[PDB]
Design a protein around this ligand. Structure first.
Ligand SMILES: Nc1ncnc2c1ncn2[C@@H]1O[C@H](COP(=O)(O)OP(=O)(O)O)[C@@H](O)[C@H]1O
Ligand SMILES: Nc1ncnc2c1ncn2[C@@H]1O[C@H](COP(=O)(O)OP(=O)(O)O)[C@@H](O)[C@H]1O
Ligand SMILES: Nc1ncnc2c1ncn2[C@@H]1O[C@H](COP(=O)(O)OP(=O)(O)O)[C@@H](O)[C@H]1O
Ligand SMILES: [Mg+2]
Ligand SMILES: [Mg+2]
Ligand SMILES: [Mg+2]
Lengths: 529, 527, 527
């Protein structure tokens, strides 16, 4: 036969192992197809009616979650077009924490609706300009659809009613108990003048009975044991020592020098006398429990047990600081008796066990305090991980609501109203950007279609009914869930409320990712190492 | 070749054809990065890193090409970049066009010496014309703003470009002087991963990458004093090997207290200095150290409300000395209060695992800090490269007492001058002069090709408009009509263009005088 | 790529660059053979056969190059060679020059359709100019001699060229008739490996490659008759399967004596015819048979003095009939004496192992035989190819009623006409006309480069001498000065040049319209 050579210019010097995609067909269309294939994977797991997914990484682990962030993190994608969407989802999760699958679906719909425009003739510049104009219009009309605000933030009968919508979307069925637990944990740790921290909530997984057996704890817990024999302590005076409970020595290498027999006979005696004196002086201040953070000794433990002093040993470089901030005490780098202002007043320090696991419970009788600890009970590690992720999502939603007390009607009425307003505004826009505006308005219909596909009803009829309801006059009417017949239902009367700043940031990041993907022309890669 | 059979060697025609093909291949690739209407590139490394940039120096290095001519071109581009600044893509394009014009006349029965002699005279005439075509202005704020806008227009979009231009102009005016030249290594480039909108402004102060270590320290401090030092505060051992020889526990405790008294004395001295400086409780005290600090000193200084830092770089001390105005002392001998700095608002910012410190509100700062913000890493790198290019362009425009209009009117004027000076050269250098004049018109052709209009008709119209009226009629990138480059606000540089022309002439002279590629080196393979 | 991973496909720019590179390579390779002052190439096959030829078609066929464009060029050259005669190297040269001129304007940003239209218009203008500039002549003996000399001057030296010219002219005049086209397949080309090459002469008759077989036969006859026949004289068997059945030895001997009676009748008839024609011991008789002859018939013919030749070619049946004037009969039905030929000298020649037969001294022969002598095989092949090319050129000049001057004045006139015709054409076809005019001037450039003079200066001088005059100023190959082409003795052809231009235009149109070389075939790697 006959073989064709290479291009004498750039293909010969391209070097083997690398690739080149200068044409728009082998680059832009390939990235669009890859993004569509990525969006078609995590599309059935979006709404509350969506199923879960069991993903196994290369570490021979088990991850049966439902959020799109964990799925994108435990996937290892070898494609830049999908890597950009993964990075955008990670940034959205780091910023807000409740808008990854929505961003992915929006980006996929935008790319799918821009591919046909690029095919029929719309260039990248006009499409990008139209998308930016539509995004600016949506960001300008978005603050006009609030009509819902949060009153008090410390009321237990109001916080649990707001995060229930976000909890039901992740854990369908058992949501009221989780919402009440999250509200109680947020109330017990709510300080003053705002400033809500996300590290003040500790989650503990204990294999026990069912889910209804779980409860909250006003304090901290540790999965350790007691070094001494003292267990039940009433009025406990915690004295945390950052230094190890042992005899302090010199940093420089130095030995002891002895000559006569008197020193050899009195060295151990003087050492024991000094140790006993230090132990008596430490316990003279009224301390009932000593929490160390290093290696303990035998003589020190014996002297502490002789004077009935509880010893707690733990090393984590974080739990000690958490306990000090909870009990209100400071760490001492030396074995010196603390002052009255450096004492840790508690309520009840005992050692019990739940689910065949010894744990030290530091329950406090105060309603306020500092931080708390949520104890989880279950029979599977995947269920406990899912409950912990739902609790973290609820905490993030509460933090977002505290930062911004503006609410928007959830479900699918807000997207339909935004699409209708964009279509009505783009009708009086001359030029070639009207097609891009109408395409951007059509991308908002991907959320109700996905919801109807996950529920099990006709998406076209639901969209038509929603459009008719929005044209009639009602604006806070979404799609019903507890009905096999495709109908409509009010979202304000039911209580389907979601955050506004989170959705705004999600839309902004989705538009940014879309324009960044559209701005990519040719692809130049190398060889894998 | 008979002595070493395992050695490839090219002749006079083969090596010349290989060099011409390599130049054409390198020119046909970098021809899509000229002007703001270019296309973006997506580079993927072997590990999985994505880089979105538009500069030619990065593309010439991230292309994976093994060739001697390509390596020389990349080295020349990197030299031009790290010596002047923006001037790599146009340099490569001009080099390729000159090599093509030389090869067009070489394969007709000519000697490259005549072409080189003609190119020398053409470069001399171009330099003589550029020495008189430059325009000298007062270099006010509007001129620098326009220069930065023209330099940053071919990077991002419009709003971010204007924001970066304003930030660069403000930083340059803040670090501006009247007797000392424009010194670099003063503006810290800090990157962030949030707020990719209108947030890349200028910070009048300094932003570090490390905060406080003691949790009991104050977070937001109002009016405080800055103490710059680099003395060691840890357990420093002696140079000679020593050892303790105690007897009982009392001697051990005494030797333990003795080795810590050396640091306790310095702690007490710092406490006394702070008490003498302050006295009441309406002021603070900030200590900036370059080495580490032991936890004992951190706990001792936390009782007096001191927010000290540890482990810093060397440029941070110079930046603080230039901004606040203190003395970067090394020992605590003559600890006078006059060797301190003045602050206004110091607050610690936390971004998850990282921790930064903001030192703003100063009296007369001389070292600012640009806070870069981006969504990912590729956008951050692109914004940083654009800011660096804009700063280099502003520095080059300030160091020179003249300005040069951009667009493509200068190239057309140089081509017209070379055409008018073509019959005034004796010998066979007329062909070389014509080739040099036709090679300089590659910038308007590429600009018209990237804009979306005709090339030959546009060049003819530009030449007619330049010949019918002695003006700096540039080339428009929106409607294709002959517009004035000095009327809109398109400005370039003179020294940069001179260095580019010199490098192009040197490369042409070095390539046209080489016609032998031999590889008779050691294989370094034993087995 | 998505449907067939093992398929190599190229785009438009890559395919165009590959085609341009292949054309440039084929033009640079076949460029030292134009003109009589060219170089000689040596080709060695895989078996170790040395071939010393100078034709462009043979050099292109024996160059070991695997490429589709090269294969198409070789096919076009072979078609031109076996249709016209001389015009293989110039075809490839003009094709490559036109492709280069087209790529020079396509790379700047043009459309191939306008270039094709301009090329078609220029080809039509050149055809009109050639049809209006051709001069009519009577084609006498001197004109054909000069044409053959000009055609053979670019093959050997001076003496051999003139000898071959005279031999070809004499053969053409001998095979010349009063009407009808000149029929070929009449001049036998026999090669002998003895003596030297300067002893080449024309033999008025036919030279056979085999002689007699019986040792008792005459070797030189002063007067004999020519008998052309193709009857079988061997023991032929019947078509149906038969069998002999005897009884004793007498019946077997009788059957043996009777089974050889069919050829005996023909032998007796031939003997009676020879005795009736001749009679005394004054004349001879030569029998030309196409099939084999049995030894008994050979002995019977030698017993009377008959020289018979067996195993002859089919082409010799017409040449002998056209030279002598006999009758090629198949059967011995009407054996009349008028069906014989007349000879003058029938003598053989021994060259070691082979044998020859020379038939000279004829009355009015119409099919001569060219005798070729050479010490080597490559020299014999080169002389045969040169003789064939000269015969083809003479036939092309005779079949046409016009003559075209050689050298390069025709190309200069065509270029001048194209330059004067481009302003009369609308659209963007002026660039195509200019490219076609510049591509047609490649013949004088190669003619002046191989001689040892300049190219640009020579072309300028030729254009200056042609514009101020009105004659066909050719290009000299001795001193480089412009001289007349239609005055010294340099001539060419009209139909050959027309076919060459048509093939060049067709190749240019086919190349400028193809921009996709997809290869989606079966690799056949099973087993
Ligand atoms: N009770 C409900 N009825 C209808 N739709 C709901 C309900 N709860 C949540 N949703 C929908 O689920 C979507 C969010 O689901 P989820 O995947 O948990 O978070 P994210 O917003 O990060 O995708 C919202 O757009 C909302 O419309
Ligand atoms: N807005 C503009 N108007 C006119 N000409 C421009 C504009 N932007 C860039 N150019 C021209 O494009 C050319 C290439 O600029 P650029 O690619 O940004 O850097 P470099 O000059 O190093 O290639 C410059 O010579 C400049 O004259
Ligand atoms: N004696 C001569 N004087 C002038 N020109 C000549 C002479 N011999 C050959 N040429 C020129 O050289 C060219 C090449 O001729 P040749 O190589 O014999 O055949 P082809 O024309 O097929 O290449 C012809 O175009 C002819 O004009
Ligand atoms: Mg969610
Ligand atoms: Mg630039
Ligand atoms: Mg010839």
């Amino acid at each position: 036969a006959l073989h064709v050579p290479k291009a004498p210019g750039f293909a010969q010097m391209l070097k083997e192992g690398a690739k080149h995609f200068s044409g728009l067909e082998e680059a832009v269309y390939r990235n669009i197809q890859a993004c569509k294939e990525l969006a078609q994977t995590t599309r059935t797991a979006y709404g509350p009616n969506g199923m879960n997914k069991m993903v196994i990484n290369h570490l021979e682990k088990l991850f049966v979650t439902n959020d799109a962030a964990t799925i994108l993190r435990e996937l290892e994608v070898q494609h830049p077009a999908a890597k950009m969407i993964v990075m955008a989802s990670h940034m959205q999760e780091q910023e807000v924490g409740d808008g990854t699958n929505f961003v992915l679906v929006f980006a996929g719909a935008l790319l799918e609706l821009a591919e046909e425009l690029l095919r029929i003739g719309l260039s990248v510049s006009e499409v990008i300009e139209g998308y930016e104009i539509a995004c600016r219009k949506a960001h300008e009309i978005l603050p006009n659809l609030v009509c819902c605000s949060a009153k008090n933030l410390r009321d237990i009968d109001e916080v649990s009613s707001l995060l229930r919508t976000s909890i039901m979307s992740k854990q369908y069925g058992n949501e009221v108990f989780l919402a009440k637990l999250i509200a109680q944990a947020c109330v017990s740790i709510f300080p003053d003048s705002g400033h809500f921290n996300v590290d003040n909530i500790r989650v503990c997984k204990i294999l026990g009975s069912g889910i209804s057996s779980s409860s909250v704890l006003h304090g901290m817990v540790f999965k350790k044991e007691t070094e001494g024999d003292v267990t039940s302590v009433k009025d406990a005076k915690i004295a945390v020592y950052s230094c190890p409970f042992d005899g302090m020595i010199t940093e420089t290498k130095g030995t002891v020098l002895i000559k006569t027999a008197e020193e050899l006979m009195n060295f151990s005696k003087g050492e024991e006398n000094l140790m006993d004196a230090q132990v008596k002086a430490i316990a003279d201040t009224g301390a009932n429990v000593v929490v160390t953070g290093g290696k303990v000794a035998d003589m020190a433990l014996h002297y502490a047990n002789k004077y009935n002093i509880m010893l707690v040993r733990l090393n984590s470089k974080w739990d000690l600081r958490r306990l000090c901030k909870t009990v209100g005490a400071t760490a001492l780098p030396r074995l010196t008796p603390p002052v009255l202002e450096e004492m840790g007043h508690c309520d009840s320090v005992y050692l019990s066990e739940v689910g065949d696991t010894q744990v030290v419970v530091f329950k406090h009788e105060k309603e306020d305090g500092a931080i708390s600890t949520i104890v989880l009970r279950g029979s599977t590690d995947n269920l406990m991980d899912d409950i912990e992720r739902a609790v973290d999502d609820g905490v993030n939603t509460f933090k977002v609501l505290t930062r911004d007390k503006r609410l928007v009607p959830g479900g699918g009425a807000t997207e339909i109203e935004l699409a209708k307003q964009i279509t009505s505004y783009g009708e009086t826009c001359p030029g070639l950007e009207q097609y891009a505006i109408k395409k951007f308005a059509e991308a908002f219909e991907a959320i109700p279609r996905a919801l109807a596909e996950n529920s099990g009803v006709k998406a076209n009829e639901v969209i038509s009914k929603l459009y008719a309801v929005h044209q009639e006059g009602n604006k806070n009417v979404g799609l019903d869930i507890e009905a096999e017949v495709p109908a409509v239902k009010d979202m304000l009367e039911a209580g389907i409320l979601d955050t506004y700043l989170g959705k705004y940031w999600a839309i902004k990041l989705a538009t940014n990712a879309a324009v960044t993907v559209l701005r990519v022309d040719q692809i130049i890669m190398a060889k894998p190492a | 070749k008979t002595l070493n059979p395992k050695a490839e060697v090219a002749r006079a025609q083969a090596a010349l054809a290989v060099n011409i093909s390599a130049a054409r291949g390198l020119q046909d690739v970098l021809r899509t990065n000229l002007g703001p209407k270019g296309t973006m590139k997506m580079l993927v490394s072997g590990a999985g890193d994505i880089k979105l940039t538009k500069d030619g120096n990065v593309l010439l290095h991230e292309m994976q090409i093994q060739h001697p001519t390509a390596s020389l071109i990349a080295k020349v581009a990197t030299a031009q970049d790290d010596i002047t600044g923006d001037g790599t893509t146009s340099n490569v394009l001009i080099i390729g066009e000159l090599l093509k014009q030389a090869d067009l006349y070489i394969s007709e029965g000519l000697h490259p010496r005549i072409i080189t002699e003609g190119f020398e005279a053409a470069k001399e005439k171009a330099l003589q014309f550029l020495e008189e075509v430059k325009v000298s202005r007062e270099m006010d704020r509007e001129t620098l703003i326009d220069v930065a806008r023209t330099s940053l227009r071919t990077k991002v979009h419009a709003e971010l470009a204007d924001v970066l231009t304003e930030a660069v102009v403000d930083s340059i005016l803040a670090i501006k002087k009247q007797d000392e030249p424009i010194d670099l290594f003063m503006i810290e480039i800090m990157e962030m991963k949030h707020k990719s909108e209108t947030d890349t402004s200028l910070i009048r102060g300094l932003v570090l990458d490390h905060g406080a270590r003691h949790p009991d320290m104050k977070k937001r401090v109002e009016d405080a004093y800055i103490l710059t030092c680099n003395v060691s505060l840890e357990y420093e051992k002696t140079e000679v090997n020593s050892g303790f020889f105690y007897k009982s526990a009392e001697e051990r405790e005494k030797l333990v207290k003795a080795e810590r008294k050396f640091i306790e004395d310095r702690v007490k001295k710092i406490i006394e200095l702070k008490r003498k400086v302050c006295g009441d409780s309406d002021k603070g005290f900030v200590v900036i150290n370059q080495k580490g600090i032991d936890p004992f000193s951190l706990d001792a200084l936390s009782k007096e409300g001191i927010v000290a830092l540890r482990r810093a770089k060397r440029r941070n001390m110079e930046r603080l000395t230039l901004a606040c105005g203190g003395v970067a002392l090394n020992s605590f001998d003559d600890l006078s209060p006059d060797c301190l700095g003045h602050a206004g608002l110091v607050y610690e910012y936390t971004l998850g695992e990282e921790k930064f410190t903001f030192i703003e509100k100063c009296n007369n700062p001389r070292s600012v800090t640009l806070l870069i913000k981006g969504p990912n890493k590729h956008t951050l790198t692109q914004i940083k490269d654009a800011v660096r290019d804009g700063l280099r362009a502003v520095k080059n425009a300030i160091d020179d007492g003249c300005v040069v209009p951009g667009a493509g009117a200068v190239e057309v004027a140089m081509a017209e001058a070379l055409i008018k000076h073509k019959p005034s050269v004796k010998g066979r250098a007329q062909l070389g002069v014509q080739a040099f004049a036709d090679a300089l018109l590659i910038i308007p052709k590429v600009l018209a090709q990237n804009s979306g209009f005709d090339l030959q008709e546009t060049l003819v119209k530009i030449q007619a408009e330049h010949s019918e009226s002695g003006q700096l009629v540039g080339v428009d990138l929106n409607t294709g009509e002959p517009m004035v480059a000095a009327e809109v606000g398109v400005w370039d540089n003179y020294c940069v263009k001179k260095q580019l022309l010199h490098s192009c002439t040197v490369i042409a002279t070095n390539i046209l005088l080489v016609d032998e590629i031999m590889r008779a080196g050691m294989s370094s393979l034993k087995g």
